[PDB]
Design a protein around this ligand. Structure first.
Ligand code: PEA
Ligand code: PEA
Ligand code: CU
Ligand code: CU
Ligand code: NA
Ligand code: NA
Lengths: 620, 620
């Protein structure tokens, strides 16, 4: 009954039928993106209109189309031809991954480069890398992928251990032309293997780990109704899934007594970028937006019980469309479980004699995605005390290069001859806030140091200051760890029992933002990544910090264009966009497969409740 | 057999006997501190000399004594009379907690202040707060406590909800004189109770939490030998316990193949300070060093199975001395267990077809302490991949005041009439490093941004720079979150297979340091807390960042005096002191008992190993 339910196989088949009947999905068409649209502001009409947005690619070279479909009424709502030279290309198709390698294997310039290196072309894998926008005028309006090569000594070999440096090719995947092959010189192909399942590399496996058993003899404390509605320890929310963003959280709310209080209308990771800091011409163009260009949701793993998710696990299996509009299930794509989380609160009082201890727990909602060499886990946590936390776990295999003779200022050496270019992993969380409703505002809170003097004779005082962000033009903010800077989202029209506005405080990790030169192509295309915090006024069509079509867009779309409208955000329907990321100088310990590193953020109640919300938690 | 074993009841009884026989422990003497001394550098003689350091207080007013005892040979090694006016007073005695309230209850000025407020003196509890050093010349050389009052409506009432503001008293606890009573005016005593076990406050307890069962059907993967030596997943270490510092980690080392490699010689939290930022004369003197002044180890809780520690738990029960030299056990004072910790490493490879997943776990060593209103958990974590992490968990009851009419810039309002002054909780970790041995150095690592130009035509490059700290005078460092600043401890004489020095990287949380004016008394006494990182050359007697006798020391002892020696630290036996802390602006949700907040730091291998150290972990 819920308009926020997951898309079903039947809905996707109906979309495919509507498009077919309308003449929009013939045999030369491919679906590059398909997703349900959220209800507009004002779904209180209960008139359910399940609408889907579709990006349709044309393999014959005709212009692509953005189509909106009403599955409820069986109609096409709108269909617009896209000018990709102006507004950007469609996301990379899974079926284009092979095309780079296959085209190159019959190009004379590529074959000559391999022959000079004594490489068998049947061993050479080619990574299909997004192109970006640089100095090649001939690429504007064309669908380009760039290719970097790795040697596979045998079919179960890890190709990442054998980069072929000094070589890169550009391919037009629609017209099937190799447009350029660039060979800056021969580098030795690193010879050591990186096969982390080879007993010669691992040695004998440890026998010292004894089992840890986590069970729930009465089952879990959360309930799932309607397929994707979760109720857990006064929290209520809907778990969505989008092929671009992955897991999306809707209608996060907290039952405070008899009253269901909204906190967040929609939470997602709306973009992620991995820019590389190696100035070599072979890789200086390399920045992939795994979300916006590749769509991380369509690469979600099936998660195995007792390996990926441990404990009493409830799964969701989201449905997405393949390139022809057929439904395909991602079996066990989302894991859902609660975890013990240590001490919640504890006091032994010298005067009252009362000893008091309570335990914490958190609800975990997660998925894993794999795009090429990298693997990422996305984890949302809900805590008993009202805290909401996000954590990204980065693992997989680092992207490699040769390590030059005489060293490098921009590459780490991992093994003899083997390098790993410096890079960042930068995320954008899009938080459509609804603190006690939709009239919200953001204040920047700084610690204030005070000088010794009158009214502060002992020089011990310190304070804090809050600055309201009133218009979008002043709502692009930077971190300041030294002054303890945080941001508070409050509802100036809803007060707690002390007559203060209710709020939530955003705690950032204060890691470095985008390091590239502000005049670079990547600074223009990933402008969101240059600042820690952006606040916009809510609009239906402002969904991604980089715009709708990231692939080969020249720059400036998304957040810089949104905030230029300079709209009123003081007690309005607002959206918080938080940039956070890891700066990765690879270490020897990251090779041949990298242990998880993490980054994220959290939101804690700030006078949202009238006292601690966990006084009613029982003793274990 | 190990010189790092825990003190036993028999050893403490022998210390008591040696002191008695030597004439040093008559009936007017009290032991204010007793602890075993670590072996000197060069214990390879195997000549075990178990030595104990003792601070002996004299209740008759004679000068106190520092005594060193050899329990092995049954001799007093040294006994020095202390000039407390010069070098500081001894730590607060547990038996002095009562004395403040009892003396005040017969003082006419105190009784008059209570009568003006219509307060029953039999209801008024008085907190025994450390005095610091301020403008009262008459306190130099005297053992002073200051008292702040709270009303207990009945014996099981939480007194913290009823602060008596506008009133403070100073007491000489040796001569039993009330030296001053200060009454700046009447404030209403907040009337609401804060009794978090009162069903009228909690409402009916939740029935929705179902059990989480964590068991180890084959027992734990770690072994304990010799009472306190731990072996777990290639880690080896000794767990010590000191009445001042609490849990101390010794000889942390990692078995890399057939070779046992040292990492950290001694790890402890060597100080902690809670400075308050309320400029009111009633509280502007208030800064307690829970470690240095009160000794957090002697207030360690007995931890209950299934409440404080959940899972397959191994306990230690450390032994300490009471004020007369009798052994007393802290039953179940240290919990020890391993925990599942999610995904360790994961990759699904598009070219090799291999799917690979491994799970992480951590070894946990923790204790909890309670000093008055506050409770703290100290957690050390060891991870499979070589990471070492510390986490402090702060909970308990916030220290309260009245909330003034018309508001305050330095106090939060928690309930009608009830305030909580702003404060910080600042810790000092003392890390006696031994990375692959004792020849170590520290480098400060910053991200380096690069400008668009020749050699960086696309403006994408970025790098890093490392600066060696060569002398103590340049080894007082500040955080810089914006440039991603970390610190690497390396051994320039031990190289990994890539011929780079082995190292470990220290990752700080980059929270604000001490906020008080640099000319204040607390900035001088807690100088360690003004900077994030200090490096000293190892010396036997340089144990605490604040000096040996913190109580009523005028300032400058400890780290500023150590680093003034300007010793060589480039490839030497060094000690890293890391300051980290929480800045606490209390929120309504912290009342009436506060949910845990956390802070800490971690160290990760940086080219310590020749590849990932967890390739030999088996599939679950
Ligand atoms: N992660 C997106 C870039 C990529 C895609 C496929 C193989 C290697 C790298
Ligand atoms: N935590 C050390 C200060 C303190 C000691 C006893 C009661 C309240 C406060
Ligand atoms: Cu990385
Ligand atoms: Cu606090
Ligand atoms: Na909003
Ligand atoms: Na050392």
């Amino acid at each position: 009954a819920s308009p926020f339910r997951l898309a079903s196989a039947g809905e996707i088949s109906e979309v495919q039928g509507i498009l077919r009947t309308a003449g929009l999905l013939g045999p030369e068409k491919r679906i590059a993106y398909l997703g349900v649209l959220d209800p507009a502001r004002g779904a209180g009409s209960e008139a359910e209109d399940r609408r889907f947005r579709v990006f349709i690619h044309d393999v014959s070279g005709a212009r692509p189309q953005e189509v909106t479909v009403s599955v409820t009424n069986g109609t096409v709502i709108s269909a617009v031809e896209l000018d990709t030279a102006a507004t950007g290309e469609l996301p990379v198709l899974e079926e284009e991954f092979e095309v780079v390698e296959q085209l190159l294997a019959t190009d004379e310039r590529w074959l000559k480069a391999l022959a000079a290196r004594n490489l068998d072309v049947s061993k050479v894998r080619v990574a299909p890398l997004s192109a970006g926008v640089f100095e090649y005028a001939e690429e504007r309006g064309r669908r380009i992928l760039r290719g970097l090569a790795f040697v596979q000594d045998f079919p179960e070999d890890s190709a990442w251990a054998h980069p072929v440096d000094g070589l890169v090719a550009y391919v037009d995947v629609v017209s099937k032309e190799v447009t350029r092959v660039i060979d800056t010189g021969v580098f030795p192909v690193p010879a050591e293997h990186g096969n982390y399942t080879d007993p010669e590399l691992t040695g004998p496996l440890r026998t010292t780990q004894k089992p840890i058993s986590i069970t729930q003899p009465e089952g879990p404390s959360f309930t799932v109704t309607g397929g994707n509605h979760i109720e857990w320890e006064k929290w209520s929310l809907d778990v969505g899934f989008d092929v671009r963003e992955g897991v999306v959280l809707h209608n996060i709310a907290f039952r405070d007594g008899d009253r269901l209080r909204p906190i967040i209308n929609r939470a997602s990771i709306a973009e992620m970028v991995v820019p590389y800091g190696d100035p070599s011409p072979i890789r200086s163009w390399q920045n992939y937006f795994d979300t916006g260009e590749y769509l991380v949701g369509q690469y979600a793993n099936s998660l195995e019980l007792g390996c990926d998710c441990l404990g009493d696990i409830t799964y969701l299996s989201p449905v997405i469309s393949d390139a022809f509009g057929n439904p395909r299930e991602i079996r066990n794509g989302i894991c859902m479980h609660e975890e013990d989380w240590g001490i919640l609160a504890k006091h032994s009082d010298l005067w009252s004699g009362i000893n008091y201890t309570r335990r914490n727990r958190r609800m975990v909602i997660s998925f894993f995605t794999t795009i090429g060499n990298y693997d990422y886990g996305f984890y949302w946590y809900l805590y008993l005390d009202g805290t909401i936390e996000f954590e990204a776990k980065a693992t997989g295999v680092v992207f490699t290069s040769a390590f030059p003779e005489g060293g490098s200022d921009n590459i780490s050496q991992l093994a003899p001859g083997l390098g790993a270019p410096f890079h960042q992993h930068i995320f954008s969380a899009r938080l459509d806030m609804a603190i006690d409703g939709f009239t919200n505002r953001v204040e920047e809170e700084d610690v204030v140091r005070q000088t010794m003097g009158p009214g502060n004779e002992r020089g011990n005082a310190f304070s804090r200051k809050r600055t309201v962000l009133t218009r979008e033009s002043e709502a692009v903010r930077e971190a300041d760890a030294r002054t303890g800077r945080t941001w508070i989202i409050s509802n100036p029209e809803s007060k707690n029992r002390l007559n203060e506005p209710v709020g939530y405080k955003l705690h950032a990790h204060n890691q470095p933002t985008l390091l590239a030169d502000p005049g670079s192509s990547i600074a223009r295309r990933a402008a969101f990544a240059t600042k820690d915090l952006w606040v916009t006024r809510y609009a239906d069509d402002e969904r991604y910090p980089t715009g709708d079509f990231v692939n080969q867009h020249s720059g400036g779309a998304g957040l810089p264009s949104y905030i230029a409208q300079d709209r009123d955000i003081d007690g309005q329907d607002i959206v918080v966009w938080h940039t956070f990321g890891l700066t990765h100088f690879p270490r020897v310990e990251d090779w041949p497969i990298m242990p998880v590193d993490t980054v994220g953020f959290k939101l804690r109640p700030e006078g949202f409740f009238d006292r601690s919300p966990v006084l009613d938690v029982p003793a274990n």
